[PDB]
């Protein structure tokens, strides 16, 4: 009974010469009429052919999607820290100051421009 019971925890560890003896001993017990098979043989014959081992494994396990997600997060964080360094060290011209973008609004108010949705040149 030990060769048949609990094959769900040992089938992927046995070599390929002890796997072809369990199949060649359940293929001479299935020729008998059924109702004469034990419950463990019915479970083992199901797990051997239609079971989640070998070519029926999923592509993505649960412990792989976390790996992909956390590979993407530290793929975005590094680019943010590189881009921040090219942002402190900039050539800021004299026009991008708030006191220069508030004087232009008076000129655009006197000469009526954007009477629709809006004019505002302030972006600090």
């Amino acid at each position: 009974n030990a060769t048949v019971t609990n094959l769900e925890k040992r089938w992927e560890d046995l070599p390929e010469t002890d796997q072809k003896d369990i199949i060649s001993q359940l293929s001479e017990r299935q020729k008998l009429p059924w109702k004469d098979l034990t419950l463990s043989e019915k479970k083992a014959a199901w797990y051997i052919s239609f079971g989640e081992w070998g070519p029926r494994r999923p592509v993505h396990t649960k412990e792989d999607k976390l790996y992909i997600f956390w590979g993407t997060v530290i793929g975005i964080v590094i680019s943010a820290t590189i881009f921040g360094a090219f942002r402190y060290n900039r050539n800021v011209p004299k026009t991008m100051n708030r006191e220069w973008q508030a004087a232009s609004d008076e000129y655009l108010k006197s000469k009526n421009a954007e009477p629709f949705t809006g004019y505002s040149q302030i972006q600090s």
């Binding site: 299935q30 059924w34 098979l37 479970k43 014959a45 199901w46 797990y47 239609f50 079971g51």
Partner: protein, 100 residues
């Protein structure tokens, strides 16, 4: 173009002539690939085809495909109240009575 009453004669004829396990699983694989579900007569021939080739897992996996092909649950339980003398004579047990 094919009708229900020609589908359910052609696949009975094709199930009553298989000789190996490859052929039984070949005919079973392209029977569940149409818009028409198999009749209770065709599935009655498939279990005897699995018996002649002496396989047990295929006779259980036939009943598992009926859960996915059939639209609702009441039709599925209508399939198991006609295919009951076939099951209890051959000895086939479902997956949800084994808990594998």
């Amino acid at each position: 173009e094919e009708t229900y009453e020609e589908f359910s004669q052609r696949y009975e004829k094709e199930f009553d002539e298989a000789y190996d396990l490859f052929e039984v699983q070949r005919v079973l694989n392209n029977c569940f690939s149409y818009d028409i579900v198999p009749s209770p007569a065709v599935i009655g021939k498939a279990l005897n085809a699995c018996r002649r080739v002496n396989d047990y897992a295929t006779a259980v996996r036939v009943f598992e495909g009926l859960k996915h092909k059939v639209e609702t649950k009441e039709q599925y339980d209508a399939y198991l109240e006609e295919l009951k003398d076939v099951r209890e004579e051959l000895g086939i047990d479902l997956k949800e009575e084994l808990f594998p």
